[PDB]
Amino acid sequence: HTLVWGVWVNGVDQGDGRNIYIRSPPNNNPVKNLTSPDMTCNVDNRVVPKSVPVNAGDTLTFEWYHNTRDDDIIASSHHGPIAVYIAPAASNGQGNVWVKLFEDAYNVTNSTWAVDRLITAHGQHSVVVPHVAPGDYLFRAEIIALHEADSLYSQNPIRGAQFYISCAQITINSSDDSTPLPAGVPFPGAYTDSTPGIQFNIYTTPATSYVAPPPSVWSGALGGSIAQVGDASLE
């Protein structure tokens, strides 16, 4: 159970974005139904009044929280991967539009999942803004908590992989469009019951065996890391 507070750009906090430049849901409940429109941008997908200005090559940091800013972030039980996707705003996230900019699942050296590291990072993870066409975009940050992913929601609706999905409205101003955005996958649609990484038993299967759900990360990506870029508590 986690939500996005806002973003940072190049290490500078852009301010509370909830319902402003984040298409925030009303609470931190997961989405579980892989076929639902809620997979696109969560349960209150509508245009919000602001878009954060960035340029190609900027670092865009999402900052998550649980109940209050810079708290425990997400329950430690919620081991799983993190991804970030991009789509043009004109799509409203519909159709085959989402292109993967970042994936992190399990770090063997550290023996930690992405979520574990997100907690350590005070909720912060980043991507580098790609050289796509200037214009309005949606950046879709997605945390998959696997603690009940031994079951499939479609079979047992009280269990399943839990998706914490947040869409930020981002305007890319300066970019040479030298890596134009390639085809994307749909959400809902890309993840199905048989997709690798959706059904997994984190209690019996070694974490080193985990394969996150495709698509692969786009070659045009620059991204990205799970790491604290700024100290929220100084504000």
Ligand X SMILES: *[C@@H]1O[C@H](CO)[C@@H](O)[C@H](O)[C@H]1NC(C)=O
When asked if residue 171 is in the footprint of ligand X (CB under 6 A), the reply is no
Q: Could you say which residues in the range 144-163 bind ligand X, by CB under 6 A?
A: 157
- 77 is a site residue for Cl ion (CB under 5 A): yes
- Determine if the peptide bond prior to 206 is cis (ω within 30°): no
| Residue 169 engages Cl ion in binding (rule: CB under 5 A) | no
Q: Tell the smallest beta-carbon distance from residue 207 to ligand X (Å).
A: 29
Angle formed at CA 100 by CA 176 and CA 49, multiple of 5 degrees: 70
Check: CB of residue 185 under 8 Å from CB of residue 103.
no
Q: From the list Cu ion, Cl ion, ligand X, none, pick the one residue 228 interacts with, judged by a Cβ distance below 5 to 8 Å according to partner type.
A: Cl ion
Rounded-to-integer distance, Cα 22 and Cα 168, Å: 4
Tokens of 179: 């890596």
Q: Break the chain down into helix, strand, coil percent, rounded to 5.
A: 10, 30, 60
Residue 77 interacting partner from ligand X, Cl ion, Cu ion, none (CB closer than 5 to 8 Å by kind): Cl ion
Q: How far is the CB of 159 from Cu ion (least distance, A)?
A: 13
Residues from 7 through 46 that contact ligand X (CB under 6 A): 33, 35-37
DSSP assignments along 20-52, one per residue: TTB---SS-PPB--TTSTHHHH-S-----S--E
Decide which of ligand X, Cu ion, Cl ion, none touches 72; Cβ closer than 5 to 8 Å per partner kind: none
Task: Find the part of the chain contacting Cl ion (CB under 5 A) among 89-97, 107-115, 136-144, 184-192.
Answer: 184-192
C-alpha distances (whole Å) from 58 to each of 159, 172, 200 are 38, 10, 35
Site for Cl ion, rule CB under 5 A = 31-33, 35, 50-51, 56, 68-69, 75-77, 105, 121, 126, 131, 175-176, 188-189, 200-201, 205, 211-212, 218-219, 224-225, 227-228, 230-231
Note the residues at the interface with ligand X (CB under 6 A): 33, 35-37, 157
